[PDB]
Amino acid sequence: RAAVFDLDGVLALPAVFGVLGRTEEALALPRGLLNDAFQKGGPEGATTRLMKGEITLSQWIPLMEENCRKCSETAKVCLPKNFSIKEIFDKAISARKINRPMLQAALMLRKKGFTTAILTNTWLDDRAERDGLAQLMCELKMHFDFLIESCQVGMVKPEPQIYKFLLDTLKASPSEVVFLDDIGANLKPARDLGMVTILVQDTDTALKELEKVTGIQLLNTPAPLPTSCNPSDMSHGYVTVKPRVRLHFVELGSGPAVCLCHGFPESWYSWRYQIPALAQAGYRVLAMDMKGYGESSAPPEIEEYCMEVLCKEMVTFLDKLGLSQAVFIGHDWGGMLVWYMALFYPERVRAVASLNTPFIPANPNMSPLESIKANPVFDYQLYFQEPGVAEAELEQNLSRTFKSLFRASDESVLSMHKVCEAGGLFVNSPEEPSLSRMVTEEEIQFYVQQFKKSGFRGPLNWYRNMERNWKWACKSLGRKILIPALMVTAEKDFVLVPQMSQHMEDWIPHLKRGHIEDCGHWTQMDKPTEVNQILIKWLDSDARN
């Protein structure tokens, strides 16, 4: 089964075709005059040539300028001194947006096994503002299995040839697919060839007919999750910052650089929902694979994981990447690394942002080891001190480990209070936890194959530099974070709760704040929508500048 959507008028908001009407009324010009010059000599038409990619857009514009000296001429009329078919067409273009509900449907059908695709008559945009269309094209193109373009296949919508073509590339028979257009003309062929057809008068009904003809709920359906990241379609980057330390990241998007530092014990994958989203927002995302995790080198020494070297290494990463700075957004430990980054390398930090992790100054008087036994929640933080031990029960059964950790506040199957005495973090938990409702079985077998590499020693050593991380931290007792910084708290996070971050103003005067109720500790995978909403809003005004 399949589904083909025309771009204009089905996935594109104000279907360009319409403008020659709109425009016409505005200048009060002879009804239909325009959408008449747009279609001269049927096939010999300038428009059709453009359709077939024989001429560039910039070429066709003038041939359409002319008709508008012949189309208005025969109907005994006249036109304004500077009649911009160019200007009128830019606006129309820049004006079309995505038909969100429609895209939502094509996404669903794919989701429930449908080879979706776009069949569309299109020109070869060589305009000076081509990038805008090319930009939207990307957003859409991305969610479809195929994207057939007239100017690319030298065939145009009506010709039954393109259909046989589309039907070919679609490895399917007419009777297995639907076809939605806003043009009767192009539709007959589908129907006169087999495939179910739907005239897209109004979206609301189109989908009404669609969900109908498919027995799949497409309309007024639950607000979906942002786009996740397929680890195979990602651009994987590498940088060797030191002799035995290579760093892996994932790159997507262009524009201001946004470095994402995940937490413990995750990967660059933890941001699966904010990577496509932020990239789309107008940023260049670099989803860090922190030191010790997955594809990044994972040396044994406990010391190689203190914030000081972790931070000198992040700069080194910027350096070898040719970046003056970047906006570091962090989580869990990633959040701590970030606070220090803004505390020791302001120049290099355009904007600071942490999720859950609070900027807490260091207590020169009480050593962290002490000052941490001074908190119930932080009991597992003890059980992590003896190299070898924690590695053990964690590296014991990767699947079990992640299905146990990556659990919502309520879903829990652990209780980090009294663990050492408990003799393990999984002591009283099922050796086969039920799947969390935040993650699919696949998303888990992914963190499984990742940790199969360097294990849990590298990750467990971040917890093993208390004394060091504290000492270096005192050097910055006089400092003050005056760069754009955001502190985002989660209601149901139990180990890193909102309260801890309440005094962050005394150190960060202009600290903005975000909060997310009914939100666990794995912020990214639990409340992606909010997270993206909150970080994009902040990025537009506090970072980008």
Binding region for substrate: 380
234 lies in the binding site for its own copies (CB under 8 A): yes
Query: By C-beta, is 153 or 495 nearer to its own copies?
Result: 153
Question: Judged by CB under 8 A, does residue 55 bind its own copies?
Answer: yes
Query: Within 127-156, which residues bind its own copies (CB under 8 A)?
Result: 130-131, 133-135, 137-138, 141-142, 152, 154
| CA distances (Å), origin 112, targets 1, 105, 145, 353 | 10, 11, 13, 37
506 binds its own copies, rule: CB under 8 A: no
Q: Annotated binding site for Mg(2+): which residue ranges?
A: 6, 8, 182
**Of these residues, 293, 379, 521, 542, which one is catalytic?**
521
Q: Which does 174 bind (CB under 5 to 8 A by kind): ligand MZL, its own copies, none?
A: none
Number of residues in contact with its own copies under rule CB under 8 A: 57
State both tokens at 255: 């524009």
Rounded to the nearest 10°, the torsion over CA 359, 362, 366, 369 is 60
Is 332 marked active-site? yes
> Which one of ligand MZL, its own copies, none interacts with residue 344, CB within 5 to 8 A by kind?
its own copies
Residues that bind ligand MZL (CB under 6 A): 264, 332-333, 336, 357, 380, 405, 407, 412, 414, 416, 425, 495-496, 521
Closer residue to its own copies, CB minimum distance, 273 or 384:
273
332, 493, 526, 542: which one is catalytic?
332
Per the CB < 8 A criterion, the answer to whether 6 and 182 are in contact is yes
The secondary structure of 28-63 as a DSSP string is: T--TTSHHHHTT-STTT-HHHHHHTTSS-HHHHHHH
Hey, what are 242's tokens?
A: 């030191």
121 binds its own copies (CB under 8 A): no
Residue 392 CB, nearest approach to its own copies (Å):
34
Q: 307-321 and 333-344 helices cross at what angle (nearest 10)?
A: 70
State the minimum distance, in angstroms, from the CB of residue 80 to its own copies.
25
Lookup result for tokens 């696949």: 442
Nearest to 10 by CA among 223, 201, 152: 201
Q: How far is the CB of 536 from its own copies (least distance, A)?
A: 15
Backbone angles phi, psi at 5, to 5 degrees: -120, 130
Kindly state the smallest distance separating residue 460's Cβ from ligand MZL, in Å.
Answer: 11
In this complex, which beta carbon is closest to its own copies, that of residue 135 or of residue 440? 135
Task: Give yes or no for residue 475 binding its own copies (CB under 8 A).
Answer: yes
294 close to 453: Cβ distance less than 8 angstroms: yes
Strand partners, 351: 327
In the complex, the smallest distance separating the C-beta of residue 159 from its own copies, rounded to whole angstroms, is 16
Which range touches its own copies (CB under 8 A), out of 84-92, 121-129, 197-205, 422-430?
Answer: 121-129
Closest Cα partner for 143 from 114, 123, 163, 180?
114
Residue 143 is a catalytic residue: no
| CB distance 405 to 436 below 8 Å | no
Length of the chain measured in residues? 545
Query: Of the listed 269, 293, 340, 463, which one is catalytic?
Result: 463
Any contact of residue 74 with its own copies (CB under 8 A)? no
The residue (of 253 and 433) whose beta carbon lies closer to its own copies is 253
Q: 350-379: which residues touch its own copies (CB under 8 A)?
A: 350
Q: Are 469 and 305 in contact (CB under 8 A)?
A: no
Which of its own copies, ligand MZL, none does residue 148 bind to, with CB < 5 to 8 Å depending on kind? none
CA distances from 385 to 339, 374, 400, 422, 465 (A): 23, 16, 22, 15, 9
* Partner whose binding site includes residue 340, from its own copies, ligand MZL, none (CB under 5 to 8 Å by kind): none
Q: How far is the CB of 481 from its own copies (least distance, A)?
A: 8
Q: Select from 3, 6, 36, 49 the one that contacts its own copies (CB under 8 A).
A: 49
- Please say whether the dihedral angle defined by the alpha carbons of residues 244, 249, 254 and 260, taken in this order, is positive or negative: negative
Work out which of 237, 299, 361, 455 binds its own copies, going by CB under 8 A: 237
Q: Is 464 in the site for its own copies (CB under 8 A)?
A: no
The residue among 167 and 481 lying less far from ligand MZL, judged by its C-beta, is 481
CA 324 from centroid of its chain's CA atoms: 24
Question: 436 Cβ partners below 8 Å, 6+ apart?
Answer: 403, 406, 407, 408, 411
Distance of CA 196 to the CA centre of its chain: 33
3-state class (DSSP) for residue 465: coil
Q: What angle do CA 420, 422, 426 make, to 5 degrees?
A: 95
- Cα 139 to Cα 127: distance, rounded to the nearest angstrom: 20
Query: Could you give the CA distance from residue 69 to residue 471 in angstroms, rounded to a whole number?
Result: 80
- Closest distance of CB 247 from its own copies, Å: 9
Q: How far is the CB of 249 from its own copies (least distance, A)?
A: 9
Provide the annotated active-site residues: 332, 463, 521
Interacting residue ranges for its own copies, rule: CB under 8 A: 49, 53-56, 58-59, 124-126, 130-131, 133-135, 137-138, 141-142, 152, 154, 232-240, 251-254, 257, 279, 284-285, 319-325, 344, 346-348, 350, 475, 478-483
